[PDB]
Amino acid sequence: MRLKKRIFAAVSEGCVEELRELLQDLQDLCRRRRGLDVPDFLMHKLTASDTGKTCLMKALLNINPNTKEIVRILLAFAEENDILDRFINAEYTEEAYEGQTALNIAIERRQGDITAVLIAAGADVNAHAKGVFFNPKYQHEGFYFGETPLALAACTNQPEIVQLLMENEQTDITSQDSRGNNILHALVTVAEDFKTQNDFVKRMYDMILLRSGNWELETMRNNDGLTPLQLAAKMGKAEILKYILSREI
């Protein structure tokens, strides 16, 4: 057998027709003697045992004109077999990329439409990865963004995704990461004294506070005991610091 490898090949090239046929083959196989229950059996067939990469992650890492349809098929298949939540929330197991999920891959790759579907279909909007991105498209691998989907969308200037997540009451907007940083501390780390970005970060900062109403984001302290303003002062970032101060009046 090479069913698993065929399925990874199909989602990677975007062969929608072949994928449907292969997943019918996989369904048929469930009836046969196996050493696992159906959900563990399917998850193994759909997950590289090596790295923990699922075929959903493989699909999002290889964007092509058929990706949205292939994502629909994979989620339908998982849902038909009662493993939708387990499948969509699977995490990389390879140490370097530990904790990365389908949802992080879609956001970093700026796939807003797919991102909305992944969230509605049950992707954990509070999941934190502390490994680096696997094969990121736009950001450096070790890009620091405050370790949440909301903070990832904000720090990469994707305000429609930030708005979608803030409307979702499952999202923990005041979450603090392994540094004790909340989304505003994260924005402070991404700010710089430029002119080409000297817009998006402060606009995002303002939009998050205005739309969330979570004013306490400004007064909560990270592990070094620093509010976002004090973090900007510690980092010697004059411009975002003057922006934050301006909020006082």
Curated annotation (Swiss-Prot):
Expressed in keratinocytes and hair follicles. ANK repeats lie at residues 2-32, 54-82, 98-127, 145-175, 182-214, 224-246. It is found in: Cell membrane; Cytoplasm; Lysosome. Belongs to the transient receptor (TC 1.A.4) family. TrpV subfamily. TRPV3 sub-subfamily. Non-selective calcium permeant cation channel. It is activated by innocuous (warm) temperatures and shows an increased response at noxious temperatures greater than 39 degrees Celsius. Activation exhibits an outward rectification. The channel pore can dilate to provide permeability to larger cations. May associate with TRPV1 and may modulate its activity. Is a negative regulator of hair growth and cycling: TRPV3-coupled signaling suppresses keratinocyte proliferation in hair follicles and induces apoptosis and premature hair follicle regression (catagen). Homotetramer. May convert from a homotetramer to a homopentamer to allow pore dilation. Interacts with TRPV1; may form a heteromeric channel with TRPV1. Interacts with SNX11; this interaction promotes TRPV3 trafficking from the cell membrane to lysosome for degradation. This is Transient receptor potential cation channel subfamily V member 3. It comes from Mus musculus (Mouse). The gene is Trpv3.
